[PDB]
Design a protein around this ligand. Structure first.
Ligand SMILES: [Zn+2]
Lengths: 38, 1480
């Protein structure tokens, strides 16, 4: 003769990889620049 | 006399000639003294005497500089005296010539001091004055030969000065300071005199004189430039170039362009470096003016200089100099010449590796104002300049300044180009121009589509977008690339060299086109483009580009599956490397790429040892870590090759090489694959920005980035495909789904339908693995729509074997079609439609070889090789192998088809031909073969001591399974590994107890092992960027940490090593279900009891015979769960409670059935073993007597364990044990056992003993802990026994404070009523919780993720009393990245439940908590109601927190099960994961 109890819900799952931190790779260095004759 | 002086001079000349050989000029020196006596005063005579002293010195050749200096000083004094006096006799000139000849002989010494140089300068100045006086005389002008000879001698003199100054400069160290610093003044003087002399000379004489003078001035400037006194080097070089340029155009017609190029080059270089740019640019203008009447190829270098000075001026902050162009300075030049110069400035600006948007925009604007539109040539030139404008506006926002979009500019350019009627000569240039316009139309339309996608994502922050691909654009846009390729093929395939202005642009555009083809998943057309690039590079003699193109061809050919053609192109690439400078970064990069390609070829050709050596050398090379984007891409390819080598079984490589490879940082292929993806994403961030891959910079288009952008996009899609396939094959469907979704988002952003279809098919397979038929069918229907959209029961399976359609000509589309058929067959077989599934599988079986043949023919047609590829390319072999595996399993279901039986042998032959590349499928087929040979008591009964109350077939089955096990054990798929291990454990039995125990242990929680290995790699990388326990745990969980040997010796040694680390007092029981049909649930239970200092005990319980079998128990559990879900819908309270009470009674009967009808007498294998000596003596006595009764495998440990629980062994259990172990004389055994139990009555069960339960993904569902025998024992669950060892390792280093010290009851965080749904729960726990000392939490509000993270990392106890497990507040991935210190009491529905989807292993957040290091995890196995779980929570909290310090949590977990009204529906729900935990 008791009332009804509410059933707790077990929700659930995205599992997104994210991890966008990255190592901020070093940009290509300058890497910039014949005059030999008698 | 009038001719006496001439006679004396002639005699002295003959004397000097003799002195050159015989030194006869000594008697002639005496004769000269006699002449000076006869002629008292004669300047010619004194000069002759000085020249005689110099001739003596030249006979000495080289001597002290003092003598030469004195002789030259005397000569200078004599010359000054003669010239000052009015005596310009030719005899003085003859004496000076003799002295100069003597010095030239002395010039062979090539040794002169600064003083010697100055003295020679003074002598040369006197001689020059005399020569000028002689030229002033009318005699020189009267005879042209006389003037010519006078000039010849004059320039010969300064030429000697040149040689002297030039040699003096070389023979000088850094110490030489003022030496050249002063020599430079006289250098300016000589230049001035030489230029002054050039006046008057005309014709060939003039051309020669400017030539020579320029030659020596260049020689002196070269040396002066080297001295770093640029200021001095300029001062000398100014007037010559000023004269050479400001003259009227055409005055100097034949002076060589390069000879002028040198002098101007030196000045501009000096002008540039000295830091003043302005007159450097003006010098470039003067340089162009000097060469104005000539071809443009010479003007190319002056143009490059202009850009260098201007780029440096822009860098140095100057903006006024940045603005000025050549139009603002070269006014007056014929527009044609001006336009060609502007084209060269644009090209030099493109060469720059910086940001040059406005600079190019300004040039394009001036070019467009300059070209007259009305003329046809003007329209064609305007079209070209509009293509340039299209590029600039395609990657920069100048639309407000120009009032035109890139698309409109390029479309107008195309309209202008299609109206061009060209001359027969300029047809090739039109071809190249149209190809560039079409390529850049494609690029700009693609960029606009990308920006639309980015804005679309930024607005609505996607299966609708997948079908939202406009077909019109797909065909029309792709046609642009096909037409550009046709034009370039026409231009380049001809024998004659193309008659185009810039073949360098053609090569760059071809690289961009090849990158685009590889992105649009059209690789054969990329192969054609790369063959054209090699033709262009060979014409340009650019060995770097030829080598790079050959390397790309080899890579693409290996990806397509052809090793022999790749080998041909690899040797072609190797040959070009020899023509390259070895100190250049390009050479190193291409050599390392070639070594990587040889390593891959050796891998494909089964030369694994050589390939491993090469790969190791590449990995250990210090140059690989250079910070450049090409080096990053090389590292990506290196990582993919590492993954390829890690997928090989252990027998292919020796132990030492395996350790050497794994020591580089990656142990499993997926780890290496994930790192390649991360590196690719970092490259994408460097090239562009995060917008292409995320939702929220400037792109530097210096040509290199252009091709690299598309290359990296193609490579990230390829790496994602590899990762998805590998992870799905393993069984990690969630991570594979995540990668697939990311890739699909990228492909929808870029609007590529082929790659979209590929990833949709992969997603469909992943959803099929989860038994989600609805979403799988949705994905497959999307695939079908995309395939019908790209092609212009499906129609592509009706195509002819030799078909030339879009689907059949493209290997990618053919693979997608076959994969779609495979997934559709799987769906039909999972829906119970056997026939249609089998027919679809047969379609796949037929299709794969036909597709291989078509690709073979297409490859031969593209590459024009006479011999066909040795073997058909191997890219569809995995699809064929999977089809064979599925058909063999289906034949297992139907043992009476007689064709599917032959399919097993066909598949085994196919896979055995391709060892070791198809090993997982070989293992699956071998397992199916073993099952066929197996198909009651079954053959396992002879190998097991307890039967329930080579040559032999079993030996052959064991050998086959051993081969399969060693084929997959290095990187095992979860389901196949579990099946193989448990089948081998059944076969081995008690013949090898240790091998059986190892096999049972290895079969549980393999996916968790893979995930832990990946997480450990991430943590080690994080630590290294910013570890001994981590290394030990990685070695513990590794798959390759085995010695060499035959099965199962190294595995047994590793197991015994693991057995030695078991903590004392811990009993490990592994319960596993033996499955004799993949996809089903077995009725055989494998139980292994692992203890310290005790041999492992294993028992098989066949439950299929009993009416209550394991499958029945699982079905009843699922029925109870379903009814519980259905009962909550009821609104009548009384009926609701009646249903709840019935469900509780069903649960109680289920638990009783577990203990009584699944385990039976063996329940004692789960119970602790006594330390009292009675049971051991009893077992020792009983072993012999029972061996006489018929015990096949007498085990003292088993008897001791069973006899240690003699106080509760019922006569039914004793009868079962006796009648099972001893089947020949059962009653004698029963009598002995009964007597032993009688003498063992009154034993004390050990107190400090703990049980760890390792269950199967199916057996984990059941409430084992609530069995009547286990209600008084401390029981927890662990994913695996290696997790117990990892817990011990962590505990040694003090990384688990709760397991080392205890739980501080004041360090607690609670989340109560987070969603404000459960009001009864809050009122009951709010005050009690808030009133506790040091307790902090969130009531009525959603906790922030930082709050939950601090709860888990900083507190010792975490209590969640809301809905579910709170996976929304902190998802499993966040929990993984933390260190779990707290005890997680998650009171919610299905909190500790693992979701079993299909044949995949259970998944849940409890696993993430355990891998994060949680000491203990308490949660519910199924769904509960709020009030009764509140009663359980209150009882547990009161009992544990009120017990006092040093109170075990598990004791009050067990005691609190009596609190709920529903004892077996609510009280049986809570289970504990981890290790026992007490209070501080
Ligand atoms: Zn076709």
């Amino acid at each position: 003769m008791d009332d009804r109890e509410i059933m707790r819900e077990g929700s659930a799952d995205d599992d997104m990889l994210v991890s966008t931190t990255t190592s901020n790779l070093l940009l290509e260095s300058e890497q910039s620049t014949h005059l030999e004759y008698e | 006399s009038p001719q006496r002086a001439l006679c004396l001079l002639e005699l002295t000349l003959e004397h000097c000639r003799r002195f050159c050989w015989s030194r006869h000029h000594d008697k002639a020196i005496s004769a000269v003294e006699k002449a000076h006596s006869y002629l008292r005063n004669t300047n010619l005579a004194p000069s002759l005497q000085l020249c005689q002293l110099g001739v003596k010195l030249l006979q000495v050749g080289e001597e002290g500089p003092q003598a030469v200096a004195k002789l030259l000083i005397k000569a200078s004094a004599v010359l000054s005296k003669s010239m000052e006096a009015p005596s310009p006799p030719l005899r003085a000139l003859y004496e000076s010539c003799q002295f100069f000849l003597s010095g030239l002989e002395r010039g062979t010494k090539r040794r002169y001091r600064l003083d010697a140089i100055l003295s020679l300068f003074a002598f040369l100045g006197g001689y020059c004055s005399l020569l000028q006086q002689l030229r002033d005389d009318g005699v020189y002008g009267g005879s042209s030969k006389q003037q010519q000879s006078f000039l010849q001698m004059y320039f010969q003199g300064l030429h000697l000065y040149t040689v002297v100054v030039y040699d003096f400069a070389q023979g000088c160290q850094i110490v030489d300071l003022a030496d050249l610093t002063q020599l430079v003044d006289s250098c300016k003087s000589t230049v001035v005199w030489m230029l002054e002399a050039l006046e008057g000379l005309s014709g060939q004489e003039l051309t020669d004189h400017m030539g020579m003078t320029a030659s020596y001035t260049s020689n002196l400037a070269y040396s002066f430039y080297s001295h770093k006194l640029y200021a001095e080097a300029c001062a000398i070089s100014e007037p010559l170039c000023q004269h050479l340029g400001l003259v009227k155009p055409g005055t100097y017609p034949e002076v060589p362009p390069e000879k002028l190029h040198r002098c101007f080059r030196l000045q501009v270089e000096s002008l540039k470096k000295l830091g003043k740019q302005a007159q450097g640019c003006k010098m470039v203008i003067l340089w162009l003016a000097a060469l104005q009447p000539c071809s443009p190829e010479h003007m190319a270098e002056p143009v490059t200089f202009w850009v260098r000075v201007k780029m440096d001026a822009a860098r140095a902050g100057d903006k006024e100099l940045q603005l000025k162009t050549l139009r603002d300075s070269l006014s007056g030049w014929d527009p044609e010449t001006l336009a060609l110069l502007l084209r060269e400035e644009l090209q030099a600006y493109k060469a720059v590796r910086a940001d040059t948007g406005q600079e190019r925009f300004n040039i394009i604007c001036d070019l467009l104002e300059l070209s007259p539109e009305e003329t046809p040539a003007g329209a064609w030139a305007r079209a070209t300049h509009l293509v340039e404008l299209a590029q600039v506006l395609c990657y920069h926002d100048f639309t407000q300044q120009t009032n035109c979009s890139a698309l409109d500019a390029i479309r107008e350019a195309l309209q202008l180009l299609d109206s061009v009627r060209p001359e027969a000569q300029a047809r090739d240039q039109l071809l190249d121009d149209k190809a560039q316009a079409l390529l850049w139309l494609y690029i700009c339309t693609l960029e606009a589509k990308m920006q639309e996608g980015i804005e679309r994502d930024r607005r609505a922050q996607f299966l609708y977008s997948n079908i939202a691909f406009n077909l019109a654009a797909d065909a029309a846009q792709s046609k642009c690339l096909d037409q550009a390729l046709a034009l370039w093929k026409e231009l380049l395939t001809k024998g004659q060299a193309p008659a185009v202005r810039c073949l360098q642009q053609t090569a760059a555009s071809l690289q961009i086109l090849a990158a685009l083809y590889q992105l649009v998943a059209k690789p054969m057309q990329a192969l054609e483009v790369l063959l054209l690039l090699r033709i262009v590079s060979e014409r340009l003699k650019d060995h770097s580009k030829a080598a790079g193109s050959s390397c790309h061809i080899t890579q693409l050919l290996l990806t397509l599956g052809c090793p022999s053609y790749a080998q041909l192109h690899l040797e072609e690439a190797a040959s070009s490397l020899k023509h390259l400078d070895q100190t250049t970064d390009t050479y190193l990069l291409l050599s390392l790429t070639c070594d990587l390609l040889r390593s891959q070829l050796y891998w494909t050709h089964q030369k694994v040892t050589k390939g491993v050596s090469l790969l190791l050398s590449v990995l250990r090379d210090p140059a690989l870590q250079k910070s450049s984007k090409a080096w990053y891409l090389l590292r990506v390819q290196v990582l993919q090759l590492v993954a390829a080598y890690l997928s090989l079984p252990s027998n292919n490589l020796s132990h030492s090489l395996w350790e050497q490879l794994c020591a580089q940082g990656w142990q499993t292929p997926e780890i290496a694959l994930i790192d390649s993806h991360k590196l690719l994403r970092s490259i994408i961030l460097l090239l562009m920005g995060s917008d292409i891959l995320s939702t929220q910079t400037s792109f530097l288009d210096y040509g290199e980035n252009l091709v690299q952008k598309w290359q990296v996009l193609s490579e990230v899609l390829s790496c994602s495909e590899k990762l998805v396939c590998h992870l799905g094959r393993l069984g990690s469907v969630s991570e594979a789904k995540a990668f697939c979704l990311e890739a699909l988002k990228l492909t929808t952003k870029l609007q590529i339908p082929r790659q979209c279809a590929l990833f949709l098919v992969l997603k469909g397979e992943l959803e099929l693995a989860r038994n989600d038929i609805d979403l799988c069918q949705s994905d497959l229907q999307q695939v079908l729509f995309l395939l019908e959209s790209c092609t212009e029961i499906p129609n592509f399976l009706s195509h002819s074997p030799t078909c030339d359609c879009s689907l059949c000509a493209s290997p990618v589309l053919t693979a997608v079609c076959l994969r779609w058929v495979l997934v559709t067959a799987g769906v039909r077989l999972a829906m119970g439609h056997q026939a249609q599934g089998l027919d679809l599988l047969q379609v796949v079986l037929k299709g794969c070889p036909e597709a291989a043949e078509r690709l073979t023919q297409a490859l031969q047609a593209s590459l024009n090789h006479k011999t066909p590829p040795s073997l058909v390319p191997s890219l569809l072999d995995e699809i064929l192998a999977q089809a064979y595996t599925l058909l063999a399993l289906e034949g297992l279901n139907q043992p009476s088809n007689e064709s599917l039986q032959k399919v097993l042998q066909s598949g085994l032959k196919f896979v055995a031909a391709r060892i070791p590349h198809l090993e997982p499928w070989r293992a699956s087929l071998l397992l199916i073969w073993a099952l066929t040979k197996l198909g009651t008591t079954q053959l396992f009964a002879s190998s097991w001591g307890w039967q329930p109350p080579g040559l032999s077939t079993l030996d052959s089955i064991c050998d086959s399974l051993s081969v399969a096990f060693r084929g997959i054990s290095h990187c095992p798929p979860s389901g196949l590994y579990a099946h193989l291990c448990r089948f081998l454990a059944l076969c081995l039995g008690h013949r090898d107890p240790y091998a059986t125990a190892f096999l049972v242990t290895e079969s549980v929680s393999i996916t968790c092992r893979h995930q832990l290995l990946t997480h450990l790699h991430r943590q080690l990388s994080k630590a290294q960027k910013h570890d001994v326990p981590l290394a030990r745990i990685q070695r513990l969980f590794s798959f390759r940490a085995l010695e060499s040997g035959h099965f199962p010796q190294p595995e047994k040694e590793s197991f015994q090593e693991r057995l030695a680390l078991i903590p004392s007092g811990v009993t490990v029981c592994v319960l596993a279900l033996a499955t004799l049909q993949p996809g089903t649930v077995g009725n055989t239970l494998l139980l292994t009891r692992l203890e310290k200092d005790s041999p492992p005990v294993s028992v098989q319980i066949p439950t299929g015979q009993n009416k209550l079998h394991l499958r029945s128990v699982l079905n009843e559990f699922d029925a109870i769960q379903k009814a519980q879900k259905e009962n909550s819908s009821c609104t009548d309270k009384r009926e609701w409670w009646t249903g709840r009470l019935a469900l509780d009674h069903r649960m109680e009967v289920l638990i009783a059935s577990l203990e009584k009808s699944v385990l039976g007498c063996w329940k004692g294998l789960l119970l602790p073993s006594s330390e009292e000596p009675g049971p051991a003596q009893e077992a020792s006595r009983l072993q012999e007597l029972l061996q006489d009764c018929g015990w096949k495998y007498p085990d003292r440990t088993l008897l001791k364990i069973m006899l240690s629980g003699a106080g509760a062994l019922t006569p039914q259990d004793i009868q079962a044990l006796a009648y099972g172990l001893c089947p020949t004389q059962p009653e004698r055994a029963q009598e002995l056992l009964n007597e032993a139990v009688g003498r063992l009555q009154g034993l004390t069960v050990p107190s400090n003993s703990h049980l760890v339960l390792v269950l199967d993904k199916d057996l984990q569902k059941l409430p084992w802990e609530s069995m009547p025998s286990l209600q008084a024992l401390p029981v927890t669950r662990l994913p695996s026994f290696r997790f117990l060892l990892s817990y011990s390792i962590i505990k040694e280093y003090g990384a688990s404070p709760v397991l080392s010290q205890g739980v501080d009851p004041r360090s607690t965080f609670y989340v109560l009523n987070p969603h404000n749904n459960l009001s009864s729960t809050e009122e009951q726990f709010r005050a009690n919780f808030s009133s506790e000392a040091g307790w902090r939490g969130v009531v009525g509000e959603v906790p922030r993720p930082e709050q939950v993270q601090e709860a888990l990392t900083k507190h010792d106890l975490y209590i969640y009393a809301g809905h579910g497990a709170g996976a929304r507040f902190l998802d499993g991935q966040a929990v993984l990245r933390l260190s779990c210190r707290a005890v997680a009491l998650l009171f919610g529905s299905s909190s500790a439940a693992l979701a079993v989807h299909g044949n995949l292993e259970g998944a849940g957040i409890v696993l993430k908590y355990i891998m994060a290091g949680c000491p203990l995890f308490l949660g519910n196995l199924w769904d509960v109601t709020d009030r009764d779980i509140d009663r359980y929570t209150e009882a547990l909290l009161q009992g544990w927190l009120g017990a006092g310090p040093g109170a075990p949590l598990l004791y009050y977990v067990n005691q609190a099960r009596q609190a709920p009204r529903l004892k077996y529906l609510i009280g049986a729900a809570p289970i504990a994961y981890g290790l026992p935990v007490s209070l501080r």
